[PDB]
Design a protein around this ligand. Structure first.
Ligand SMILES: [K+]
Ligand SMILES: [K+]
Ligand SMILES: [K+]
Ligand SMILES: [K+]
Ligand SMILES: [K+]
Ligand SMILES: [K+]
Ligand SMILES: [K+]
Ligand SMILES: [K+]
Ligand SMILES: [K+]
Ligand SMILES: [K+]
Ligand SMILES: [K+]
Ligand SMILES: [K+]
Ligand SMILES: [K+]
Ligand SMILES: [K+]
Ligand SMILES: [K+]
Ligand SMILES: [K+]
Ligand SMILES: [K+]
Ligand SMILES: [K+]
Ligand SMILES: [K+]
Ligand SMILES: [K+]
Ligand SMILES: [Mg+2]
Ligand SMILES: [Mg+2]
Ligand SMILES: [Mg+2]
Ligand SMILES: [Mg+2]
Ligand SMILES: [Mg+2]
Ligand SMILES: [Mg+2]
Ligand SMILES: [Mg+2]
Ligand SMILES: [Mg+2]
Ligand SMILES: [Mg+2]
Ligand SMILES: [Mg+2]
Ligand SMILES: [Mg+2]
Ligand SMILES: [Mg+2]
Ligand SMILES: [Mg+2]
Ligand SMILES: [Mg+2]
Ligand SMILES: [Mg+2]
Ligand SMILES: [Mg+2]
Ligand SMILES: [Mg+2]
Ligand SMILES: [Mg+2]
Ligand SMILES: [Mg+2]
Ligand SMILES: [Mg+2]
Ligand SMILES: [Mg+2]
Ligand SMILES: [Mg+2]
Ligand SMILES: [Mg+2]
Ligand SMILES: [Mg+2]
Ligand SMILES: [Mg+2]
Ligand SMILES: [Mg+2]
Ligand SMILES: [Mg+2]
Ligand SMILES: [Mg+2]
Ligand SMILES: [Mg+2]
Ligand SMILES: [Mg+2]
Ligand SMILES: [Mg+2]
Ligand SMILES: [Mg+2]
Ligand SMILES: [Mg+2]
Ligand SMILES: [Mg+2]
Ligand SMILES: [Mg+2]
Ligand SMILES: [Mg+2]
Ligand SMILES: [Mg+2]
Ligand SMILES: [Mg+2]
Ligand SMILES: [Mg+2]
Lengths: 124, 52, 148, 183, 141
RNA sequence: GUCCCACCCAUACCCCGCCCUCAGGGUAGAAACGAUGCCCUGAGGAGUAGGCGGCCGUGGAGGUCAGUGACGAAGCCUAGG
RNA sequence: AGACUAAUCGAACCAUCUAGUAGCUGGUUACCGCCGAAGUUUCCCUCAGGAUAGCAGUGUCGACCUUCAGUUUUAUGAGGU
RNA sequence: CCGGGACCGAGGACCGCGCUCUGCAAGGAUGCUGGCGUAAUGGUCACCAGCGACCCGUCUUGAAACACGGACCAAGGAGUCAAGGUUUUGCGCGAGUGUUUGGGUGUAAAACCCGCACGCGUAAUGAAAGUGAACGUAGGUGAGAGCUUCGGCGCAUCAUCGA
RNA sequence: AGAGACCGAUAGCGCACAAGUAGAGUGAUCGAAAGAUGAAAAGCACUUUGAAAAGAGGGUUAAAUAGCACGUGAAAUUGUUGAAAGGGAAGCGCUUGUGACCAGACUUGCGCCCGGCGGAUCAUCCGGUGUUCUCACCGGUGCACUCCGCCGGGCUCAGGCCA
């Protein structure tokens, strides 16, 4: 069912803070690392370079962890796990684990419909 | 092979801890919070006559 | 445990907390107590004064059993009486007998006197006794005697 | 810019105990409530001393209590946020009532054998929720073997770190004028 | 004595076998817990008075604990089944909580949980078919 | 060379929103609370060598989810979320 | 010729002592938050190195101690640029 | 005292200060109306356009350097363990404390039990022979949290004179 | 002979294999690399093209995306197909545009009134049993202006995106 009312969601940034010089070397993964060299131009905040993450980019406490519909994800593995959301169907949504068989997946989706709970990975 | 594998414990602190565990075994809410199924036992502590 | 260590926190940072100019080399300054009189004199004189030199005379083949004589003060003389009997004397219910205390059987050789003594006569046996200790026992109405 | 000497300065005193005793947590909840809902200065002092470590809570003996039960304090209630120990030197125990964090086995037995009574810090809050007719006692903070070594130096008369005692252990040069100088 | 409801919460506040923790929230799969949240207020197995509701074949089933039988778990619950009418069940449950001073703070939660269980026993209406927007041209061929 | 108007833009100054850090308050004859929570108020945020705190991952061990799995576990690929 | 002694000679080749010692060069592996330096004093066969004082962090405790200050004012001393 | 524009709407029952006082512009935005209900708003990627942007690690007062290492990728790769010290945190007992060298026992390298010696502490000072801690309610003076019958009593600790 | 909070084929002994082996040195001596088809060889009969190695059909198998160059099969590097850019490097940051591709959200919900359909038994009282001792459950009564469910019609309110 529709989610509880909330303030509008703001993100402050959508890009990903990629690692310096990982676009030139294939041995360097893209995950962020903090430069520590004595001359590094990114560490010294030269104009025109990559940015570094800071606590000032954080999200509003009221809208943190909620997907654009307005719910928060909750991972379930069987039928009894989805019944924990009986009293939270305007704030939480169910997400079925990757390693659940196709028969159990049918049972979970049927039960969640009776409870009015949204399922994120439903179609299969 | 000469690293420390064993640990020395004061005997007084050993006896304190075993007594504290016996007392907790007579609290039914604690039995359920440790995963035991005790919904059909008549009393706790459970005592049986010497028929064994 | 290895997971509570600053070693784990230094991973990813050059020099491991040891500095870029000074480098944590092998043994700058010597090994052990080297340089005590030359370049470690400032340390050895602020702490440990009296370190260098000789004082006193020697003693070849010292046997420590010749010098065994532990001592006890009069302050704790009554604690050597068993607790139930001790309370009868203090409350004033004996008034006809006196206790006889053997210091050697409790592991003491000399009786010193530091505190006070209640006015109840006692009999003490000891190998040694101090001058003040003998005065206080006698003034309470007791007597000390020597036993070897 | 704002031109300040200090910024983000933290407090220098504890705000909670560092222990994980479950019953000490119940005791702290009780006195947090009392200190907020009462004007008694006594309650605030007791709350702070429940946060402290063992070297800041030195023990108190029966002899030290008897010294302060003189000159018109014979009928007050003694409060000690610490352990209360026994003293062999004291031969006659006066009668008193004491509230303490804990008692040793012989200290408790001698207090009751003389006609007194022992309390717990939660029994005290029930009988004297404002700390009326009480006296607070602390043990000797500096009577610790480690404090004798603090601040060693020339002309300080402190205790040195040595492995033995005798004529061959740090008594020659710098300790007497017949070998160089003295301290 | 040495044991009370406050003590039991102190030893079970950080971990117990009913806990379900992940990001975005912490839950409890406890039978005597309404709203299935982890908190002193709702931790039924800790408190001396607690309420629990489970679905029945037709209506709802309600359990509460008898304070005189805390050490006899076989006979420590008082069980009632309501299967006549929705409004009748709401009234009996509300009275069971806030009439004789037995956890009047659980009055709002107990009624709402019974409402959710009865709502889920109705027939489920069919869903509309899904429409297409970019794969539509793909399947138009 | 001297004097006078108007105008242009810094991560500086003023007003508003959000994040964190520090400081100060409220909350039980409990219709009560992840009291390690929630509510109210003000100020602050540069950094090598270095210090401390909190968190994320990996191989094994005790306990617990009466957890997932040949109707497909683990691993691998994927300008799909 | 200090030449030759198995492509090896101003002292051959092989195994072991041996992971020989280095005040000297090179390297030293995830993230976020708060604080934040020194190249100066004294001694050393000391001058590319140490100890010692200073500068820095962390833990606290005593009172929330009319308590202090890289400053002005008033009265009163010293100085030979 | 009247006009004209721009950016913004945090909060969520009532409570307060007030005013021009049937009410209000006074402790934070509401009312009315139109189009569309899907790739229209929105997101990811590729490419052109305006402005900006020297190669990293390292020693150094000073590195983009005509200063050294680095053709590329996968797997391996560096503050550890023991004994002995020390300060600080948590815990047990407390003028004492420490079962485990050994013995008893066992569901057998576990868990449980025992106590004679011994170690550290309870007394120092001298090279040594040796000697060995109360005049006083365990002292006087100035501060001192807390309590108080409102006269005072005075913890911890600091300065000072004595035994 | 029995075991383990040990290692899992660049690890663990130099050696999990015809390993102190093959190989080097006149000699003393030095000393490697190298594990895994499938449950079962059922390890491809026959036809056809080719001098042959082999290819194309056709068979076995649960599977040949398991064929002895054999479990799974990553990166560096390469071929074909498809999309795109290029006036003496390329790569990157902020911000629009175009093309390609795409996740959500919405589809109605509660309430009131009118009519039809079906089922009960709604309030009250009597008996029994629980329990928080005043609040409930079960049996009996009730029997059409009460209670519950469905369908049809009307009305108010709340609901998605951009202005
Ligand atoms: K890369
Ligand atoms: K920062
Ligand atoms: K360091
Ligand atoms: K001596
Ligand atoms: K001399
Ligand atoms: K781990
Ligand atoms: K040769
Ligand atoms: K040097
Ligand atoms: K002059
Ligand atoms: K605000
Ligand atoms: K270098
Ligand atoms: K280079
Ligand atoms: K310690
Ligand atoms: K002993
Ligand atoms: K005072
Ligand atoms: K090998
Ligand atoms: K050969
Ligand atoms: K199969
Ligand atoms: K086939
Ligand atoms: K295969
Ligand atoms: Mg993001
Ligand atoms: Mg620099
Ligand atoms: Mg550089
Ligand atoms: Mg650093
Ligand atoms: Mg270096
Ligand atoms: Mg150094
Ligand atoms: Mg600023
Ligand atoms: Mg900062
Ligand atoms: Mg390992
Ligand atoms: Mg799989
Ligand atoms: Mg890729
Ligand atoms: Mg030759
Ligand atoms: Mg080495
Ligand atoms: Mg070597
Ligand atoms: Mg700063
Ligand atoms: Mg010299
Ligand atoms: Mg150098
Ligand atoms: Mg003070
Ligand atoms: Mg202060
Ligand atoms: Mg001059
Ligand atoms: Mg708003
Ligand atoms: Mg419209
Ligand atoms: Mg678009
Ligand atoms: Mg440029
Ligand atoms: Mg140049
Ligand atoms: Mg070089
Ligand atoms: Mg090179
Ligand atoms: Mg490996
Ligand atoms: Mg073995
Ligand atoms: Mg191999
Ligand atoms: Mg090998
Ligand atoms: Mg293989
Ligand atoms: Mg073939
Ligand atoms: Mg297969
Ligand atoms: Mg191959
Ligand atoms: Mg293969
Ligand atoms: Mg490739
Ligand atoms: Mg290009
Ligand atoms: Mg009936």
């Amino acid at each position: 069912v529709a989610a509880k009312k909330h303030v509008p969601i703001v993100k402050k940034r959508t890009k990903r803070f990629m690692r310096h010089q990982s676009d030139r070397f294939k041995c360097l993964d893209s995950a962020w690392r903090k430069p520590k060299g004595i001359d590094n131009r990114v560490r010294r905040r030269f104009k025109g370079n990559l940015a570094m993450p800071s606590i000032g980019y954080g999200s509003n406490k009221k809208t943190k962890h909620m997907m654009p519909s307005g719910h928060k994800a909750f991972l379930v593995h069987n039928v009894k796990d989805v019944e924990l959301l009986l009293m939270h169907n305007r704030t939480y949504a169910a997400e079925i684990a990757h390693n659940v068989s196709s028969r159990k997946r049918i049972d979970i989706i049927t039960r969640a419909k009776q409870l009015g709970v949204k399922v994120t990975n439903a179609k299969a | 092979i000469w690293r420390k594998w064993h640990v020395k414990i004061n005997q007084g602190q050993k006896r304190f801890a075993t007594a504290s565990a016996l007392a907790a075994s007579a609290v039914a809410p604690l039995l359920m919070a440790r995963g035991h199924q005790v919904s059909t036992v008549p009393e706790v502590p459970l005592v049986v006559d010497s028929a064994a | 445990p290895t997971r509570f260590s600053k070693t784990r926190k230094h991973r990813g940072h050059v020099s491991a907390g040891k500095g870029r100019v000074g480098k944590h080399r092998k043994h700058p300054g010597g090994r052990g107590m080297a340089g005590g009189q030359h370049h470690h004199r400032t340390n050895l004189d602020k702490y440990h004064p009296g370190y260098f030199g000789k004082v006193g005379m020697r003693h070849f083949h010292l046997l420590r059993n010749h010098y065994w004589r532990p001592s006890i003060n009069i302050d704790k003389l009554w604690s050597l009486v068993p607790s139930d009997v001790r309370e009868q004397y203090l409350s004033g219910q004996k008034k006809d007998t006196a206790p006889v205390i053997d210091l050697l059987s409790h592991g003491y050789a000399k009786l010193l006197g530091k505190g006070r003594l209640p006015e109840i006569p006692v009999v003490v046996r000891a190998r040694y006794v101090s001058a003040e200790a003998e005065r206080k026992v006698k003034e309470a109405g007791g007597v000390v005697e020597l036993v070897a | 810019g704002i031109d300040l000497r200090w910024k983000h300065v933290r407090s220098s005193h504890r705000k909670a105990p560092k222990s994980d005793n479950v019953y000490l947590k119940l005791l702290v909840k009780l006195y947090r409530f009392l200190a907020r809902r009462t004007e008694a200065p006594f309650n605030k002092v007791v709350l702070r001393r429940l946060f402290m470590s063992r070297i800041n809570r030195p023990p108190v003996s029966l002899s030290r209590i008897a010294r302060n039960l003189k000159n018109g304090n014979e009928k007050k209630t003694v409060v000690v946020v610490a352990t209360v120990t026994d003293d062999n030197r004291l031969l006659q125990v006066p009668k008193m009532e004491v509230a303490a964090l804990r008692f040793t086995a012989k200290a408790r037995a001698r207090i009751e054998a003389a006609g007194g009574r022992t309390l717990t810090l939660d029994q005290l809050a029930l009988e004297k929720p404002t700390g009326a007719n009480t006296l607070l006692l602390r043990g000797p903070k500096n009577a610790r073997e480690a404090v004798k070594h603090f601040g060693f130096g020339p002309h300080k008369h402190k205790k040195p770190y040595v492995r033995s005692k005798g004529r061959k252990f740090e008594r020659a040069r710098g300790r007497r004028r017949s070998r160089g100088f003295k301290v | 004595s040495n044991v009370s409801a406050d003590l039991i919460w102190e030893v079970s506040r950080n971990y117990n076998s009913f806990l379900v923790k992940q990001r975005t929230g912490t839950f409890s799969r406890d039978a005597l817990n309404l709203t299935n949240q982890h908190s002193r207020k709702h931790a039924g197995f800790v408190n001396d008075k607690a309420l629990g509701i489970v679905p029945a074949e037709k209506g709802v089933k309600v359990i509460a604990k008898k304070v005189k039988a805390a050490n006899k778990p076989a006979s420590s619950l008082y069980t009632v089944t309501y299967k006549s009418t929705a409004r009748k069940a709401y009234k009996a449950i509300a009275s069971q909580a806030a009439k004789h001073g037995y956890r009047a703070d659980l009055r709002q939660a107990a009624v709402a949980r019974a409402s959710a269980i009865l709502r889920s026993q109705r027939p489920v209406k069919p869903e509309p078919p899904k429409k297409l927007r970019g794969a539509a041209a793909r399947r138009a061929a």
